[PDB]
Amino acid sequence: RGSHMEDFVRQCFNPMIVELAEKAMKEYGEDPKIETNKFAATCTHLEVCFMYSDGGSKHRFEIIEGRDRIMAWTVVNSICNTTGVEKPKFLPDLYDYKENRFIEIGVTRREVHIYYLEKANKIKSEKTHIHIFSFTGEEMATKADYTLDEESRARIKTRLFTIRQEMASRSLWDSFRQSE
Ligand SMILES: COc1cc(CCNC(=O)c2[nH]c(-c3ccccc3C(F)(F)F)nc(=O)c2O)ccn1
Ligand SMILES: [Mn+2]
Ligand SMILES: [Mn+2]
């Protein structure tokens, strides 16, 4: 092992996000020491969800990402069985209480159009909202409803570009970009 990417991941993201990403990949049969770009991407996706949920009031979002698969489904079932929304086929990331809809947050190294289409084809569920960010400052949301005020989303974009810069400064961006 001994990747430059792994050491960069541990010093760039906070320990809790690193710990959560280690559990997730290990739960799905992968190891942060080999699939190190997936390690960087899992942390990134985790941090974005956290900043996103931090963008609302206080009780607006229920965080689904960053839970055990069984407990995340339990919370999803309780949300469906109390508000009345349909149960998604694939685990979402958040649930907007203000807007009464699940949210699937994506972070891609391609143009937001293609990644959105793949997840919109994977979901095929309508209902759940889709919101994609990219490492180049662009975003894409369902029905152009970007959910959060603009300010919050702007932060996420800045954070994503800083991650890209630190990766490129360490000459690890090109392998990270051409790996998704
Ligand atoms: C197939 O690979 C997997 C699958 C899982 C199951 C749980 N996963 C999610 O629920 C999930 N997964 C991804 C994603 C997919 C492939 C590569 C990178 C990511 C990314 F961005 F995290 F970095 N994007 C999301 O938005 C998202 O909600 C875990 C670990 N690996
Ligand atoms: Mn998810
Ligand atoms: Mn997601």
Q: Which residues contact 85 (CB under 8 A, 6 or more apart)?
A: 79, 100, 101, 102, 127
User: How far apart are the C-alpha atoms of 7 and 75, rounded to whole Å?
Assistant: 34
Annotated catalytic residue within 38, 47, 96, 119: 119
Pick left, alpha or beta for residue 128 (phi over 0 → left; psi -120 to 50 → alpha; otherwise beta). beta
Please tell me the experimental approach by which this structure was elucidated.
X-ray
* 49 burial via Cβ count (<10 Å: 0-12, 13-18, 19+): buried
Tokens 């702007």 sit on residue: 154
User: Which residue of 17, 18, 30, 42 sits with most ligand 1 atoms within 8 Å of its CB, as the best mutation to test the pocket?
Assistant: 42
* 27 burial via Cβ count (<10 Å: 0-12, 13-18, 19+): exposed
Tokens 């960087």 sit on residue: 40
Measured from CB, residues less than 6 Å from any atom of ligand 1 are 24-25, 28, 38, 41-42, 45, 65, 91, 93, 105-107
